[PDB]
Scaffold this motif. Structure first.
Motif, mmCIF file in Angstrom:
data_model
loop_
_atom_site.group_PDB
_atom_site.id
_atom_site.type_symbol
_atom_site.label_atom_id
_atom_site.label_comp_id
_atom_site.label_asym_id
_atom_site.label_seq_id
_atom_site.Cartn_x
_atom_site.Cartn_y
_atom_site.Cartn_z
ATOM 1 N N UNK A 173 0.827 -1.252 0.161
ATOM 2 C CA UNK A 173 0.178 0.033 0.012
ATOM 3 C C UNK A 173 1.015 1.137 -0.030
ATOM 4 N N UNK A 174 1.786 1.361 0.990
ATOM 5 C CA UNK A 174 2.730 2.441 0.905
ATOM 6 C C UNK A 174 3.585 2.720 -0.198
ATOM 7 N N UNK A 175 4.114 1.636 -0.856
ATOM 8 C CA UNK A 175 4.676 1.586 -2.212
ATOM 9 C C UNK A 175 3.746 2.307 -3.490
ATOM 10 N N UNK A 176 2.639 1.699 -3.680
ATOM 11 C CA UNK A 176 1.890 2.055 -4.811
ATOM 12 C C UNK A 176 1.297 3.616 -4.372
ATOM 13 N N UNK A 177 1.303 3.939 -3.340
ATOM 14 C CA UNK A 177 0.733 5.264 -2.918
ATOM 15 C C UNK A 177 1.988 6.343 -2.771
ATOM 16 N N UNK A 178 3.206 5.853 -3.505
ATOM 17 C CA UNK A 178 4.249 6.747 -3.164
ATOM 18 C C UNK A 178 5.096 7.332 -2.038
ATOM 19 N N UNK A 179 4.872 6.503 -1.058
ATOM 20 C CA UNK A 179 5.523 6.290 0.128
ATOM 21 C C UNK A 179 6.776 5.762 0.403
ATOM 22 N N UNK A 180 7.498 6.012 -0.435
ATOM 23 C CA UNK A 180 9.060 4.857 -0.515
ATOM 24 C C UNK A 180 9.688 4.816 0.668
ATOM 25 N N UNK A 181 10.066 6.144 1.115
ATOM 26 C CA UNK A 181 10.979 6.174 2.510
ATOM 27 C C UNK A 181 10.252 5.302 3.482
ATOM 28 N N UNK A 182 9.019 5.770 3.710
ATOM 29 C CA UNK A 182 8.116 5.107 4.909
ATOM 30 C C UNK A 182 8.163 3.421 4.893
ATOM 31 N N UNK A 183 7.866 3.145 3.416
ATOM 32 C CA UNK A 183 7.962 1.781 2.913
ATOM 33 C C UNK A 183 9.199 1.296 3.450
ATOM 34 N N UNK A 184 10.281 1.879 3.289
ATOM 35 C CA UNK A 184 11.782 1.287 3.347
ATOM 36 C C UNK A 184 11.887 1.288 4.771
ATOM 37 N N UNK A 185 11.456 2.405 5.496
ATOM 38 C CA UNK A 185 11.690 2.111 7.009
ATOM 39 C C UNK A 185 10.955 0.678 7.597
ATOM 40 N N UNK A 186 9.762 0.720 7.162
ATOM 41 C CA UNK A 186 8.806 -0.340 7.806
ATOM 42 C C UNK A 186 9.041 -1.795 6.998
ATOM 43 N N UNK A 187 9.358 -1.949 5.855
ATOM 44 C CA UNK A 187 9.919 -3.248 5.441
ATOM 45 C C UNK A 187 11.206 -3.620 6.032
ATOM 46 N N UNK A 188 12.254 -2.615 6.123
ATOM 47 C CA UNK A 188 13.552 -3.137 6.477
ATOM 48 C C UNK A 188 13.755 -3.215 7.964
ATOM 49 N N UNK A 189 12.563 -2.785 8.700
ATOM 50 C CA UNK A 189 12.817 -3.311 10.275
ATOM 51 C C UNK A 189 12.175 -4.496 10.518
ATOM 52 N N UNK A 190 11.757 -5.258 9.663
ATOM 53 C CA UNK A 190 11.193 -6.856 9.857
ATOM 54 C C UNK A 190 12.134 -7.669 10.643
ATOM 55 N N UNK A 191 11.600 -8.253 11.432
ATOM 56 C CA UNK A 191 12.444 -9.412 12.034
ATOM 57 C C UNK A 191 11.391 -10.615 12.410
ATOM 58 N N UNK A 192 11.776 -11.726 12.258
ATOM 59 C CA UNK A 192 10.963 -13.165 12.586
ATOM 60 C C UNK A 192 10.335 -12.773 13.825
ATOM 61 N N UNK A 193 8.982 -13.211 13.988
ATOM 62 C CA UNK A 193 8.265 -13.140 15.221
ATOM 63 C C UNK A 193 8.833 -14.071 16.080
#
Length: 193
Positions: A173-193
């Motif tokens: 959703x963030x990517x297609x709506x142009x929010x790349x820096x937000x998407x980058x922060x949020x994707x890159x923060x992932x760690x397995x549960x």
């Protein structure tokens, strides 16, 4: 900052490669397609399978090259050119040897990093497209890189990768709506549960 309007998944055609690590990009895009009810159809004119539809309010095209991995540019390049989609509006999902299963990163620009799919694309559209790097692990030695990427992961590593793919899916959703820096922060923060 451009909305993403074309999402590409890299991989090889055929059921013998469908479950291999080197098709991590295909997994992501196929799962995305069915999440939003976008139908992927044979598109021989561009040597691939492609679709188009609404994702979170934006009209997005999806592409899986059917050229085999090392010739992916023979689909991505003419497709993006025909539809006049700039590299900045492209996201390319691909397996990443330099990251472990369960690790996933969004990157903008740079070179191919040794990835033989990206090697066929950077020369012709330049480097300024976005990449979803899906970690597949490194087997430990150069000689066994080919058998690793062309092989099927064990259950435990597959779950990690699937978890990481699920997370990226939730950020499209963030990517297609142009929010790349937000998407980058949020994707890159992932760690397995």
């Amino acid at each position: 900052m451009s909305n993403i309007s074309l999402i590409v998944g890299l991989g090889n055609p055929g059921s013998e490669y469908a479950q291999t690590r080197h098709n991590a990009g295909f997994w992501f895009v196929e799962q995305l397609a069915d999440k939003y009810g976008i139908t992927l159809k044979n598109d021989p004119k561009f040597h691939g399978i492609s679709g188009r539809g609404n994702i979170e309010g934006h009209d997005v095209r999806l592409l899986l090259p059917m050229t085999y991995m090392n010739r992916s540019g023979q689909s991505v390049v003419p497709f993006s050119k025909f539809y006049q989609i700039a590299p900045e509006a492209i996201l390319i999902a691909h397996d990443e040897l330099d990251m472990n299963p369960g690790v996933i990163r969004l990157k903008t620009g740079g070179g191919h990093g040794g990835h033989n799919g990206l090697r066929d694309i950077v020369p012709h559209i330049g480097p300024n497209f976005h990449r979803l790097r899906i970690g597949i692990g490194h087997p430990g030695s150069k000689e066994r890189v080919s058998g690793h990427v062309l092989g099927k992961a064990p259950s435990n590593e597959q779950s990690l990768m699937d978890g990481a793919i699920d997370h990226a899916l939730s950020k499209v959703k963030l990517l297609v709506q142009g929010q790349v820096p937000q998407a980058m922060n949020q994707i890159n923060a992932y760690k397995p549960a």
